[PDB]
C-alpha cells in the first residue's frame, strides 16, 4: 500500500 | 503501508 | 507504517 | 512505526 | 515507534 | 519536478 | 523538486 | 526540494 | 530542503 | 534544512 497526495 | 501529503 | 504530513 | 509531521 | 511534530 | 521509482 | 525511490 | 530513500 | 533515508 | 537517517 503505497499512497501520495500532490 | 506508505503515505505521503504534500 | 511509514507516514509523512508536509 | 514512522510519524512526521512538517 | 519513532514520531516528530516539526 | 516529480521523480518515482518504485 | 519532489523526489522518492522505494 | 523533497527527497526519500526507503 | 527536507531528506530522509530509511 | 532537515535531514533524517533512520
Chains 1, 2, 3, 4, 5, 6, 7, 8, 9, 10 share one sequence.
Not at 1 to 6: A, G, L, V, W
Amino acid at each position: 500500500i503505497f499512497q501520495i497526495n500532490s
